[PDB]
Amino acid sequence: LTLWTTPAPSPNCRLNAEKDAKLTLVLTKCGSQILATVSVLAVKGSLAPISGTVQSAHLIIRFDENGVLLNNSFLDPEYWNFRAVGFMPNLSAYPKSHGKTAKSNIVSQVYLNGDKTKPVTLTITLNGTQETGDTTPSAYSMSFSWDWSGHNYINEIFATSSYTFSYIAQE
Amino acid sequence: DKLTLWTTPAPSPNCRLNAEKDAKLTLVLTKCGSQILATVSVLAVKGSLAPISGTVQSAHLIIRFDENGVLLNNSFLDPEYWNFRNTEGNAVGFMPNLSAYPKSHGKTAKSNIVSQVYLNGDKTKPVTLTITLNGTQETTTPSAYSMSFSWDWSGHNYINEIFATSSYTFSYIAQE
Amino acid sequence: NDKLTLWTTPAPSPNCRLNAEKDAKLTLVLTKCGSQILATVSVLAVKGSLAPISGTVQSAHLIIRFDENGVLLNNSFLDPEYWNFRNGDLTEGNAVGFMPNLSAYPKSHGKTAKSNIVSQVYLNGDKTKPVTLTITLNGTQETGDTTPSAYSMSFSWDWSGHNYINEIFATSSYTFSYIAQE
Amino acid sequence: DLGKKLLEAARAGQDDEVRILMANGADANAYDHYGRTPLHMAAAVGHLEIVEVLLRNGADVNAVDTNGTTPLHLAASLGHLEIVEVLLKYGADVNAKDATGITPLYLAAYWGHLEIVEVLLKHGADVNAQDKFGKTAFDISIDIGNEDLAEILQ
Amino acid sequence: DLGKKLLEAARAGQDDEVRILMANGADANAYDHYGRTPLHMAAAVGHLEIVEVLLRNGADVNAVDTNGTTPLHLAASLGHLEIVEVLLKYGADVNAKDATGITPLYLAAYWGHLEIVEVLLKHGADVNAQDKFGKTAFDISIDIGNEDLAEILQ
Amino acid sequence: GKKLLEAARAGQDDEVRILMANGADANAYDHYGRTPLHMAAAVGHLEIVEVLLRNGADVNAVDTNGTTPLHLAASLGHLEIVEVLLKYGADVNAKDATGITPLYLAAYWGHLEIVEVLLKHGADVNAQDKFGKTAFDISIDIGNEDLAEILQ
């Protein structure tokens, strides 16, 4: 089964402002592992075109104890459905609030405009968030942090190549 | 099953990078519901990439498919090493999805998967591999789908080496 | 469905030997997707000269060898109590369906570029501390008095030229796939 | 559509393709939906001849994209000295602020393009300009450790 | 525990955080379960002021982790000259040997830090100390092809 | 035979005369036409290049693309090897299957001292390739100040 944003979503996530980018993310459950493919394209704001000294962006998707998005704040729940704990990142392998645990990160280079001379690092962190006080907790999370420190891409549109990864599923 | 479409695990020379049958492309597509899981490598067997000669710093292979996901003839990939494992199923289930990767949108970022692979499996000899999905442009027989592989090692001097890469895994959204 | 996964569990105890007995936790999960295995792997040293990285050590490796039924050769290098089918005993699944295909990745004296999958992983999941991981499938060919194996998977980490002394050798997670033998 | 072609040819650094298109009546002020104009494209990729053909055909020298970024921000940030000079000759605005208050001098300082920094200061660049966080080009020289830069800033 | 927060602040180079923590009673000699102390963290990341604060507060300049690595091994290996000088000023053992016989001189030589090799030699660094293969800092220079170092060590 | 090919690549200066002493053939070739002297010229093992030449290795051996050891040494920046090849009578003007010469490769990859040596040894500055480019078209091409200068 597949949990996804659809293959071509409308603006459906916030990197810096409401609906300022399209995240295409597909999670396919292959038994104990989730096979995933991801890319992002900024549609407005300070990453379209990249402006000033901006050299990073990020998005944290949080889910509740049933694997359901916590709310429409950051990824729009209208572009997020089956084609859910069976798609959540395994808490034994990627322990909640421990995104600094090396193994909870999958890190690789992706490329602006699909051009091999414009790398961008993508760090995906699984269950890396901790909520305290009054903050509603998430049970699970999946974070994408893009970073191109030291590269001057001003005037480019932040639009990445597509990238595949997998992770152990919670159930 | 009818869930694999491949060149076999060990093909004879089956593709043209510059001249007929000058390379062996190993390419396996396994359908995992809405995604295809793939693994690819290539090895040149003769011509200007075996050994790498002159200032050659790139190679490419474009595979084109018709509206039923069948390999076009006159394909630079030999249709004899391209078939379902044994059986015939539905090739459209293996094609890259045209909403995610629209036809002739090869320069759109999202239609490309780009990563480094390594000559001889050797970490000190990187080669970039750019895979482009549905990027083709015929204005030629029309293709409905395509999968391209572009190897590029600009700025690296690998003259005298044999062009033979490590294996690489990627996935993409299937058309149906 | 538990028979389609062969793994170390998601959080093993010390279960492999990089330089000394049980000196590292290898997390390795193989899931069988018909003709391909989809794998995810990472490693964390827990004692010895990679915890913290000491001296000029700039590499580590682990070779896992299997017999002709796809069963680990011995409790030498990876501990068989953290290697089994998910929720399974040895008779719950068939381990040859998880082995690297011999016709794609041969057992021979020769070297084969396509038997390697090579990519960078990162210490502490930190993009500024790369380490190369070379995975080699069936890359052993035992001679002399070495006990033979039918299949192998080896993991060679190398960070030549980077000085990571005082870091713990703990890597990010990495996905790859390969053609299955059956 | 002559605009799209002109945007693409300026971006690709096709000097002549640009001249041919101008010849055929392409609008030097076309813009894409992010507000980039051909002169942003040419300034960013560093094609001097293209910058000049456009300015001679009446390209708005201080056109802003949707974030307030001008061609002189681009050329100063990315280090294209001779483009920075030609832009200035045509009325480029040394004190243009983008949407968070960043100026061409702030970017040339941040990325270490010192000769560009000198050129901007001699054309009246305001050194006390702060971004929306209160940081100036002097704060940059301290944060990024550039001693030559801090020296030049007085 | 204040110890864990100190270990973390030293490693993240939080100069100020470390002072706050020492102000509040944090133990300068806390160690993690690999035997790393805040002084190991600070010598490795290169943070001089934290190294000084900890040493002013009684940090053990000769602490070893489970492999016998000292803060001086870390500063000499990673090339932090002023930290190497300060550790030596507080009584760091110049020829401390890790579990395989490696000294600060051998690591400074292997990674080509020539100024640190010269400071270590003036405090009595021993050119004869061999690694597990029988090789000295000198043999490693010969190997590596480093002629400047080979003359300093001979 | 193949042992030699492997020792020359691997840089095992020792093995090579071990193998030569036993009558291993200095002109062995693999199925791409590469000889031990191509392997040694490519990896830059001077000693090995000299032992092979003293044992009558063919200095002008071509692989299946017409590449000679002098192309490899010039292309990859091995100056002493370029000098010893020329001493043993390597064709300074050797053309590969597309017309490329050692001078063309030395220029392309910015090995200016080797460009100087090839010229002294009579490399034709005017040899062209595919596009009909020559070492000079390469200079103002790759935007190379000093190479434009040396091509005098």
Spell out the blueprint of helices and strands.
The complex is a heterohexamer, with three copies of chain A and three copies of chain D.
Chain A: E1 2-4, E2 21-30, E3 33-42, E4 56-63, E5 81-82, E6 105-111, E7 119-126, E8 140-147, E9 163-168
Antiparallel strand pairs in A: 1-2, 1-5, 2-3, 3-9, 4-8, 6-7, 7-8
Chain D: H1 2-12, H2 15-23, H3 38-45, H4 48-56, H5 71-78, H6 81-89, H7 104-110, H8 114-122, H9 137-143, H10 147-152
Helix pairs in contact in D: 1-2, 1-3, 2-4, 3-4, 3-5, 4-6, 5-6, 5-7, 7-8
PDB class: viral protein/de novo protein
Keywords: viral protein-DE novo protein complex, darpin, protein design
Assembly: hexameric
Any idea what the CATH superfamily of chain D is called? Ankyrin repeat-containing domain
- Structural shape of chain D: elongated
Helix content bin of chain A? under 10%
Number of helices of chain A: 0
Largest sheet of chain D: none
Strand content of chain A: 35-45%
Overall 3D geometry of chain A? globular
Largest sheet of chain A, in brief, is: 5 strands, antiparallel
* Gyration radius of chain D, rounded: 16 Å
Please report which band the strand proportion of chain D falls in: under 5%, 5-15%, 15-25%, 25-35%, 35-45% or over 45%. Answer: under 5%
Which class of chain A in CATH terms?
Answer: Mainly Beta
What is the CATH architecture annotation of chain A? Sandwich
| Backbone structural class of chain D | mainly alpha
So how many helices of chain D?
10
Number of domains of chain A: 1
Q: Quick one: how many beta strands of chain D?
A: 0
Query: What is the level-2 CATH architecture name of chain D?
Result: Alpha Horseshoe
Tally of domains of chain D: 1
Q: Can you give the helix content of chain D as a percent range? A: 40-55%
